[PDB]
Amino acid sequence: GSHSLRYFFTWSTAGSGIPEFVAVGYVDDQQFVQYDSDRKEMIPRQRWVKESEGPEYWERETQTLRGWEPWGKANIDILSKRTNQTGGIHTYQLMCGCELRDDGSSNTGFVQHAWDSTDFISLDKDKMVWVTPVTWGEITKNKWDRDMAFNQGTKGYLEGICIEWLQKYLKNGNVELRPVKPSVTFTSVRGNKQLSCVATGFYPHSIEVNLFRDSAKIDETESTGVRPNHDGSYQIHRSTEFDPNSQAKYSCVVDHDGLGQQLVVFY
């Protein structure tokens, strides 16, 4: 099994509703930590991490994010000047993380930055050079390519620190991080007009669900796509057009790595 530890940072312009800075941490598909510019502390979103991490962990994680908080705000002003934008609603985003592989394989890592939800700058870990598809990133790229300690440090995090803690998290959140199978329903709905296959309560989000008419695969099928529930699990509805009197047998087939064997359900 592949596993990941990823962080998502969002800086928003001082404005309505949303805190000026919000960061979230994920092990695989499960959110486990949160920080925002109102509370100004890194807090658990999972019990396993709350139980297994002492005062020093939360103290340090809070301090780290406190450094990130002003940084991104400064960024929004810097990039507005660079793009000659002067006001309005603006965003900075940062994505970084690592992936651990047992099947194979070479470990991966990434750090990606975005300005107003468009590619700003990111690191090529293999070449150890920063890439930018825009002119307003070039001046940052030239500074960041020079900065050895920054570059090697970031690389050390993605390849070393990130992987190491991910491994600790996988041990400490072991049962909590296990896949949970979908509970699936296959029933006539909307006054017997449509036949709907609904899978709910599954984790992680990734899922295959296909409909079959009398051993044949059904195209022209309607799907909500995977969407979150309230408890860290996910759901999906796939439905097709129907007749209640018809002779042909209908089946719904589900693939989820919480199943470990293909699951079929008949009408």
Binding site: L5, Y7, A23, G25, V33, M42, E61, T64, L65, G67, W68, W71, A74, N75, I78, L79, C96, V111, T140, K143, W144, D147, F150, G153, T154, Y157, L158, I161, C162, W165
Partner: peptide, 9 residues
């Protein structure tokens, strides 16, 4: 464990 390597733009 959050990344802590921060450098100005």
């Amino acid at each position: 464990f959050a990344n802590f390597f921060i450098r100005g733009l």
